[PDB]
Structure formats: structure tokens, C-alpha cells
Amino acid sequence: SHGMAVTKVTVDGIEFPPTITPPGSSKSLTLLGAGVRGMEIETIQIKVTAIGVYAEPEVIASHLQKWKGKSASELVEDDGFFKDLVQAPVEKLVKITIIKGIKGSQYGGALEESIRDRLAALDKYSEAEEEALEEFREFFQTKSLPKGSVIFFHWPSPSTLQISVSTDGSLPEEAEATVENANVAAALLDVFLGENSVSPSTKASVAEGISALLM
């Protein structure tokens, strides 16, 4: 439209939709915040993906009431806030837009090993998690992730992880994989929102969104 107000959200120029329906779901989630995942390799700051976090705004707000009135800065500096967010028993979705093309096995292998190690550090790695991580890794082995492809990670509840990939950025229609393991599902969300997050900018953006939502 050239005549009515339009809203656009961008992460370094990359558009994110302000709302999304998870693959295979029927309900609509709103963008809480989004950021870039950068990697410093041999002193070069490479942008590799953009990450958007979605949930039902009023619903997630109702599960974060103690944080009401906190500014974005106060939330971003508080590990307890992000732990509440990761644990909140509400539907969540993370949309990843691939910036640097990569093989699925490389993306999935790196993430799987990080989850393995992070779970081990917390003493939350047992045979159940090992098995779930094999399922996770094997899903990504079947995919290619060229520039512009999208990954949808969907948590219909905190113990269930659904995954879908689109190589053209399109939104899939049912989940391609379902991994039933509470610890792996939570650990993946924590890769984005927890300590030693891969994207401080995503965390900061989500803190801004939630701070505003709560007020």
C-alpha cells in the first residue's frame, strides 16, 4: 500500500513478518524481537543468520508479571529474566533466516554438539537426550541451507520441539520433525536466549519487546 500505514520489521535490512502461524499449527504468534547471529572468524565479523522470536503477546506477558515495569536494559542484564522466558509454559516459535549458506549437516552438527555439551555441563545429559540429539542431527543431515532458506523451530509446549526447513523462505504446512525431549527442547531455546547466547542482539531486541509489552 502507498496510502495506508504499513509496518515493516527488519534485522540489518532482512524483513521479518510481524506475525506467524507455525507449520502445522492454527494459531498466530507475534514477533517479540529479532537479531543477528554474528561470528568473528579470523577478525572478520560475519553475519550468518537472523533470528526472530515469536509468541502470543498477551499470553506470554501473563507469565512474566514479576518483570512488569522493568526497562529493556534491566531485563537484558538479568539471567533470571531469560530463564523465566525460556521456561514460560506458552507456545513459542523461532524463525531463522540463513544469511551465509551452509550444509544442513554443518548447521545441525554444530548446534547438536553445543546442546550436548551445554546439557552435560548442567548434568542434564542422559541416554534420553543422547537419543533425541541423534534425531535432531539426522533431521538436519537431510537438508541444505542456502542463503535465504528458513528454519522454523516451534515449541508447542516446552517439552516438544518441532522443526521445519524451507529453502525458499516459504512457510511449511505441518512440522517435518518432532523431537520429544524436555531438556533438548529447552537447551535449544537457551542457545538463543540463555547464557553465552549465540545472539546478544536477539536477546536485547526481545528484552525491548517484552519490556514494552509488560507496560
Ligand X SMILES: O=C1C[C@@H](c2ccc(O)cc2)Oc2cc(O)cc(O)c21
- Which residues sit at the interface with ligand X, rule CB under 6 A? 39, 48-49, 98, 100, 102, 107, 110-111, 114
Nearer to ligand X, 61 or 102 (CB): 102
Minimal distance, residue 98 CB to ligand X, in Å? 5
Site track 27-46 with Cl ion (rule: CB under 5 A), x = hit? ----------x---------
Minimal distance, residue 109 CB to ligand X, in Å? 8
* Residue 212: its H or E element: helix 200-214
**Residue selected from 49, 149, 164, 205 as contacting Cl ion according to rule CB under 5 A:** 49
* Residue 48: its H or E element: strand 44-55
Site track 89-128 with Cl ion (rule: CB under 5 A), x = hit? -------x--------------------------------
Number of other CB atoms surrounding residue 78 within 10 Å: 14
The entry of ligand X, Cl ion, none that residue 110 binds, CB within 5 to 8 Å by partner kind: ligand X
Minimal distance, residue 114 CB to Cl ion, in Å? 11
Residue 89 near residue 55, CB atoms below 8 Å = no
The entry of ligand X, Cl ion, none that residue 100 binds, CB within 5 to 8 Å by partner kind: ligand X
Strand order in the sheet with 92-98: 19-20, 29-41, 44-55, 92-98, 150-157, 160-166, 177-180
Minimal distance, residue 96 CB to Cl ion, in Å? 5
Q: What is the dihedral of CA 103, 142, 25, 80, to 10 degrees?
A: -50
Nearer to ligand X, 29 or 133 (CB): 133
Report d(CA 184, CA 180) in Å as an integer.
8
Question: Shortest Cβ contact with ligand X: which residue?
Answer: 110
* Residue 183: its H or E element: helix 182-193
Q: Is 199 helix (H, G, I), strand (E, B) or coil?
A: coil
| Residues forming the site for Cl ion (CB under 5 A) | 37, 49, 96
